[PDB]
């Protein structure tokens, strides 16, 4: 009978969601003028990797970015001058994530080892060394992010989000309320709470302090491949395996408006907002990226310079550049 | 016009270019294999003849070839999300047990293994990477209902699942009590390298 009770609760929650859907973000912003066609050029290309790259993350200074390849390497690129600060060799090549700590001292990576190796970049010995190896997952580790210099958050193929603790190496909390897999997560500018993706076409709003999902968003269709909050942490744009970027709301608890184009039928693998939030750059399974106006739902300049699937991208903290990394082993800085 | 410090920084960045290039060069001579199959359908015994909680990278050598055999059995997640991770693999060693039609594990193990082989062989990533079928565990195996004819029919049923002219499935039959499973893989890998070099020449 509990299944029927759950169905009734779902019906009442969706009725409540519909009761607060007077506007669709397209009836509004008509008076707002459209953004001019954004022309973006490859300012710098980072041709150092040798195989597919599955993640990149910008430092707080917006000058250093760490990328993970299948060569078995993390590389800490100097974005402004295309220099390799650190070439971290991994124990196991199959890595599918990165995380540059808010302090430039710590980095993380691990995708199929079930473990997010945490590397220390500021050591008296002068070489990057594995500061920790967190082993508590039973599936591929899709994404990991840093809250502080310690106390990271990871999501793995075993349908769990961790919230590790670097000093002790143990599960500080655990986020097990997820029916399907998880592929990517995004943490708020204030790290009190974050969200995680899925493979059951949903996104969950996890609270870091007390482990639970405060809100769930199942309006999407096929899969989730990337998440990123709106700056100020109120609306996370979601990835898609059906070429449909969407941004939900933490307060309205519902989807605002879907971003789709019948021209392209592919799967997003990475989404990141702009600094102000007008742009919603998404790297598609279409050998390129795209720029979406976050308020008019329209399209903008297409950023096509890649040879394979665009696997990662991130707008800098100061919002100056947007580097994208694809399976062609080339990180391209776009400004 | 770079400063004294930034010239040294560029020297370091160029000196770890050489190390990375050498690491990539030394990691391309070896050949990577992806080991797949049904649930414990002769995987463990074959892996034993060749030589956490996720991949198991067996790392062996034979006749100057360096085989890196990645076994993925600890992954309880969907194969779709991490299957493209092995796109640049030389061959996929598909282990299947002949004593599988008797068991049921609704659908018998033969039907499940055959459907899974079809799904793997028709993945868009593995449209050019060849399959090495190991028809292992043939001792318990036993138109005509004799051992050889039924075994040949099973081989044909497995081999019929490809639909590309540039993809070749290599089959072999073992009693799981022999040392030939490295030689068979070596011969198949030599054939795969020969075919890859032929298609690189432009003549198919």
């Amino acid at each position, epitope marked *: 009978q509990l299944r029927q009770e759950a169905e009734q609760l779902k019906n009442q929650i969706r009725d409540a969601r519909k009761a607060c859907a007077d506007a669709t973000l397209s009836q509004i912003t008509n008076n707002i003028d459209p953004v001019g066609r954004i022309q973006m050029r490859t300012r710098r290309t980072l041709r150092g990797h040798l195989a597919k790259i599955y993640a990149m993350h910008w430092g707080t200074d917006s*000058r250093l970015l760490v990328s993970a390849s299948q060569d078995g390497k993390l590389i800490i690129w100097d974005s402004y001058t295309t220099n390799k*600060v650190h070439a971290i060799p991994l124990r196991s090549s199959w890595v599918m994530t990165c995380a540059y700590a808010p302090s430039g001292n710590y980095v993380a990576c691990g995708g199929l080892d079930n473990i997010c190796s945490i590397y220390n970049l500021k050591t*008296r010995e002068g070489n990057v060394r594995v500061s920790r190896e967190l082993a508590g997952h039973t599936g591929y580790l899709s994404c990991c992010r840093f809250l502080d210099d310690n106390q990271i958050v990871t999501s793995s193929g075993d349908t769990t989000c961790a919230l590790w603790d670097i000093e002790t190496g143990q599960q500080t909390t655990t986020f097990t309320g997820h029916t399907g897999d998880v592929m990517s997560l995004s943490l708020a500018p204030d790290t009190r709470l974050f969200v995680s993706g899925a493979c059951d076409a949903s996104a969950k709003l996890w609270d870091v302090r007390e482990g639970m999902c405060r809100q769930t968003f199942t309006g999407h269709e096929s899969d989730i491949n990337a998440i990123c909050f709106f700056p100020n942490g109120n609306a996370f744009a979601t990835g898609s395996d059906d070429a449909t970027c969407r941004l939900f709301d933490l307060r309205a608890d519902q989807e605002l408006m879907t971003y789709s184009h019948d021209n392209i039928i592919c799967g997003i693998t990475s989404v990141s907002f702009s600094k102000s939030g007008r742009l919603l750059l998404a790297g598609y399974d279409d050998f390129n990226c795209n720029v979406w106006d976050a308020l008019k739902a329209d399209r903008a300049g297409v950023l096509a310079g890649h040879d394979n699937r665009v696997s990662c991208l991130g707008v800098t903290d100061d919002g100056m550049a947007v580097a994208t990394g694809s399976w062609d082993s080339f990180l391209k800085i776009w400004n | 016009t770079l400063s*004294a*410090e930034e010239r040294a920084a560029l*020297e*370091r960045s160029k000196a770890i270019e050489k190390n990375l290039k050498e690491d990539g060069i030394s990691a391309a001579k070896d050949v990577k294999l992806l080991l797949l199959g049904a649930g414990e359908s002769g995987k463990s015994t074959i892996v034993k003849q060749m030589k956490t909680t996720g991949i198991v990278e067996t790392h062996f050598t034979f006749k100057n070839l360096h085989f890196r055999l990645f076994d993925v059995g600890g992954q309880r997640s969907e194969r779709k999300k991490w299957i493209h991770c092995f796109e640049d693999v030389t061959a996929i060693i598909f282990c299947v047990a002949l004593s599988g039609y008797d068991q049921v594990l609704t659908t018998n193990r033969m039907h499940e293994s055959l459907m899974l082989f079809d799904s793997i062989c028709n993945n868009k990533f593995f449209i050019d990477t060849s399959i090495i079928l190991f028809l292992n565990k043939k001792d318990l195996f036993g138109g005509p209902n004799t051992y050889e004819d039924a075994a040949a029919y099973i081989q044909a049923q497995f081999e019929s699942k490809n639909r590309s002219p540039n993809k070749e499935i290599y089959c072999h039959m073992t009693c799981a009590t022999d040392t030939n499973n490295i030689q068979v893989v070596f011969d198949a890998v030599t054939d795969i390298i020969i075919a890859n070099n032929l298609r690189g020449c432009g003549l198919y």
Partner: single-chain antibody, 232 residues
Framework: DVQLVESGGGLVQPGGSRKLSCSAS????????MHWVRQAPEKGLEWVAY????????YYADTVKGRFTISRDDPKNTLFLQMTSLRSEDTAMYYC??????????????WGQGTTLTVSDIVMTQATSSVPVTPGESVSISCRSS???????????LYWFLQRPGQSPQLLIY???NLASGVPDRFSGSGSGTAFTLTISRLEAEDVGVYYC?????????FGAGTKLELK
């Protein structure tokens, strides 16, 4: 532990030769650039030589180029300075210095001990050679550069070093905006592209050693005269 120890602590006849070997164990020697820094019976501090991470980038002080030859080996983690044609002015106690050059790195982190020996170019000045100050009071040390030391890249390659009395100096501030590892927060430096000033709030009895200033725009590196702090 991390340390660099020296070997050749012996008297040398004038017009001779010697070999100084220093061994380091704590860090990854092959990934560090290495320097050499001289001294004298006087408080003078002067640059000697340099070798890069890959041993492919060698520089020298223009006052002695062609007399000292520098080298190093990674298998034994040992850095060598072969001294040829020693004069009377070569007397010093040679410090070995590690320095790794990448964005955000701090060159000149660790200075090992040294063997005492007995027998254009940017110029920096520090007029306040003696600052008698009691503990607990803020202290200001000024260093002046002859060339605009603010490069076009936004960095200012200035280094401030402290030396405890009778100890190897430790780097205090690099680029007059960042503090070295382990340096107390009370230290603080700043300045324009020509003048540089420290603000040592809450001076203690440990912060008494002599201070040196260094420019780093060009490898013809020049140290500044020391500003000894006393208890008068």
């Amino acid at each position: 532990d991390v340390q660099l120890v020296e070997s050749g602590g012996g008297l040398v006849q004038p017009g001779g030769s010697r070999k100084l070997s220093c061994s380091a164990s704590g860090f990854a020697f092959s990934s560090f650039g290495m320097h050499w820094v001289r001294q004298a019976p006087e408080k003078g501090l002067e640059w000697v030589a340099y070798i890069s991470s890959g041993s492919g980038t060698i520089y020298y002080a223009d006052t002695v180029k062609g007399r000292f030859t520098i080298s190093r080996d990674d298998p034994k983690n040992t850095l060598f300075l072969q001294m040829t044609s020693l004069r009377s002015e070569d007397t010093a106690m040679y410090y070995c210095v590690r320095s790794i050059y990448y964005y955000g790195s701090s060159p000149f982190d660790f200075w090992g001990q040294g063997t005492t020996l007995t027998v254009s170019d940017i110029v920096m000045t520090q007029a306040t050679s003696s600052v008698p100050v009691t503990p607990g009071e803020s202290v200001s040390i000024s260093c002046r550069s002859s060339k605009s030391l603010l490069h076009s890249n936004g960095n200012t390659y200035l280094y401030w070093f402290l030396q405890r009395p009778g100890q190897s100096p430790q780097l205090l501030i690099y680029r007059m905006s960042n503090l070295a590892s382990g340096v107390p927060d009370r230290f603080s430096g700043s300045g324009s592209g020509t003048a540089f000033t420290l603000t040592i709030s809450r001076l203690e009895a440990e912060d008494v050693g002599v201070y040196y200033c260094m420019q780093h725009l060009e490898y013809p590196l020049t140290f500044g005269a020391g500003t000894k702090l006393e208890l008068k």
